[PDB]
Amino acid sequence: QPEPDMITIFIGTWNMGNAPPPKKITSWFLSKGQGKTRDDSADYIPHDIYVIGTQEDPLSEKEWLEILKHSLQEITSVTFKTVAIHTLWNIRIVVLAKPEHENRISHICTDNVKTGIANTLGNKGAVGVSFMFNGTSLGFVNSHLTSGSEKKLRRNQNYMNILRFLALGDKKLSPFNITHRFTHLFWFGDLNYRVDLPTWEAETIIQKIKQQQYADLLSHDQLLTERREQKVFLHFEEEEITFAPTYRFERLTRDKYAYTKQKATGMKYNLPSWCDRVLWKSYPLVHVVCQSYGSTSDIMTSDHSPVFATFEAGVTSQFVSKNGPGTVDSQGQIEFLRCYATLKTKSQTKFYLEFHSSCLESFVKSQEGENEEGSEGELVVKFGETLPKLKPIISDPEYLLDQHILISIKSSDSDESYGEGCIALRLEATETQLPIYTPLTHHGELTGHFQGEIKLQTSQ
Ligand SMILES: Cc1cccc(C(=O)N(C)C)c1C
């Protein structure tokens, strides 16, 4: 029974509006409704992994698990195994997998982050799950961010708190936040970004939605515009949106957007918006293809419609050779030529690098680089030919070309990371000097760049 090189992952996000679901929710898991929908010919084909994110979820974990498992059994005739479930207040994540994957999944982690302080601490934040699927690390974040059209900056701040403080994945990757710990990271939820148009334009917006003309609305979507301006979700992807805004509906129909200010809304307008979103970030040159992104039309208990997204995602096997794991394979090496970091910092400390990768027995610290001034004010940290030769555990190119090296540039004075990035070993050639590049981030904000050349020796 061969190990897979691809899996499909279903991501669902639904703000349930504190109401129990209707008796049938199978359209959600089948990616049917509006937007990029799944072909009918696939309906009986189970996804490998289903990850369900809810917000304003009134159900117990037991009640929701029973609905989800019975839903998937009805669709697929497969009884899914529960990988993980985690709830913060009314924010929940469930991970279900086909039983054949039970012995492929390990290192299951769960965590939550509460956002805000005093006033603003008490119902918003995030839950997450991570695990290994054979050789591939997967992370999943369900967040319910701050509501209200005039709070996009609060949402951005909530995002940064969540990616700093959510403790998922390999704790040995100590310089790295969740935006670097996973082969594939999926981040979804009621992100609560709105269509920023004047209140007086509400009926105009509704007209545009009825005509399925989303372009003049998406050009004012706060998540797209904040992402454009590098204020949030730097280096994440989102599929094109081709479904109607998923908020705010009258319950028990989808024929009506309820946007007018009410005591129940704190006298706020809720212009139709794409509150409910799925984004992802995968390591460079790993296969990931969005195969659906849309909203259901037939689930109407909430003032939000469910959103679905499905993905093909590349995975690797749990590789064993005669040598590693448990030793190095001297027919493998990773070398670095002409390397330098460019940093945005105004500070003057010495810097060194740390290389982290599951292809190494443990992380590697470099010597300090040589600081120079860039021609436009920048700090340039030169490593030249001084970086260590990295000794992978396995030399087979079928393993090594699928790996990645995480890089942190650290202050000698404080040992604090000033920037993190990731280099793919999926090279065009071995035993050949080739350019490498990553942006560097810290707390998910751009802090610099790392560039140079690599020379990879495999056993072939
Ligand atoms: C809407 C948005 C915002 C920020 C970055 C991107 C992106 O990945 N580009 C390659 C431009 C996009 C598509």
mmCIF file of N, CA and C in Angstrom, residues 350-353 366-370 381-383 386 412-413:
data_model
loop_
_atom_site.group_PDB
_atom_site.id
_atom_site.type_symbol
_atom_site.label_atom_id
_atom_site.label_comp_id
_atom_site.label_asym_id
_atom_site.label_seq_id
_atom_site.Cartn_x
_atom_site.Cartn_y
_atom_site.Cartn_z
ATOM 1 N N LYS A 350 26.337 42.902 16.221
ATOM 2 C CA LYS A 350 26.782 41.858 15.293
ATOM 3 C C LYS A 350 25.600 40.891 15.128
ATOM 4 N N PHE A 351 25.556 40.225 13.987
ATOM 5 C CA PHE A 351 24.507 39.213 13.707
ATOM 6 C C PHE A 351 25.151 37.894 13.340
ATOM 7 N N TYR A 352 24.462 36.800 13.663
ATOM 8 C CA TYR A 352 24.803 35.456 13.161
ATOM 9 C C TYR A 352 23.546 34.795 12.599
ATOM 10 N N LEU A 353 23.723 33.688 11.885
ATOM 11 C CA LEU A 353 22.575 32.925 11.321
ATOM 12 C C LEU A 353 22.363 31.621 12.073
ATOM 13 N N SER A 366 25.916 29.865 12.651
ATOM 14 C CA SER A 366 27.056 30.384 11.867
ATOM 15 C C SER A 366 27.919 31.252 12.779
ATOM 16 N N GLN A 367 29.092 31.588 12.244
ATOM 17 C CA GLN A 367 29.933 32.701 12.728
ATOM 18 C C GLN A 367 29.183 34.003 12.489
ATOM 19 N N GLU A 368 29.592 35.027 13.203
ATOM 20 C CA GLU A 368 29.083 36.404 12.970
ATOM 21 C C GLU A 368 29.424 36.850 11.557
ATOM 22 N N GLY A 369 28.514 37.554 10.914
ATOM 23 C CA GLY A 369 28.766 38.229 9.643
ATOM 24 C C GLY A 369 29.461 39.572 9.852
ATOM 25 N N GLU A 370 29.886 40.179 8.751
ATOM 26 C CA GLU A 370 30.510 41.527 8.754
ATOM 27 C C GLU A 370 29.500 42.570 8.288
ATOM 28 N N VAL A 381 24.576 42.633 6.145
ATOM 29 C CA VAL A 381 25.368 41.684 6.943
ATOM 30 C C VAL A 381 25.966 40.679 5.963
ATOM 31 N N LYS A 382 27.286 40.748 5.797
ATOM 32 C CA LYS A 382 27.980 39.901 4.797
ATOM 33 C C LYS A 382 28.455 38.632 5.473
ATOM 34 N N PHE A 383 28.111 37.507 4.888
ATOM 35 C CA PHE A 383 28.608 36.206 5.326
ATOM 36 C C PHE A 383 29.704 35.714 4.372
ATOM 37 N N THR A 386 31.724 32.307 4.332
ATOM 38 C CA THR A 386 32.027 31.940 5.737
ATOM 39 C C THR A 386 30.954 30.996 6.313
ATOM 40 N N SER A 412 23.864 38.972 18.107
ATOM 41 C CA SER A 412 24.866 38.377 19.025
ATOM 42 C C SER A 412 24.630 38.871 20.461
ATOM 43 N N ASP A 413 24.219 40.117 20.630
ATOM 44 C CA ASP A 413 24.060 40.785 21.950
ATOM 45 C C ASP A 413 22.838 40.218 22.687
#
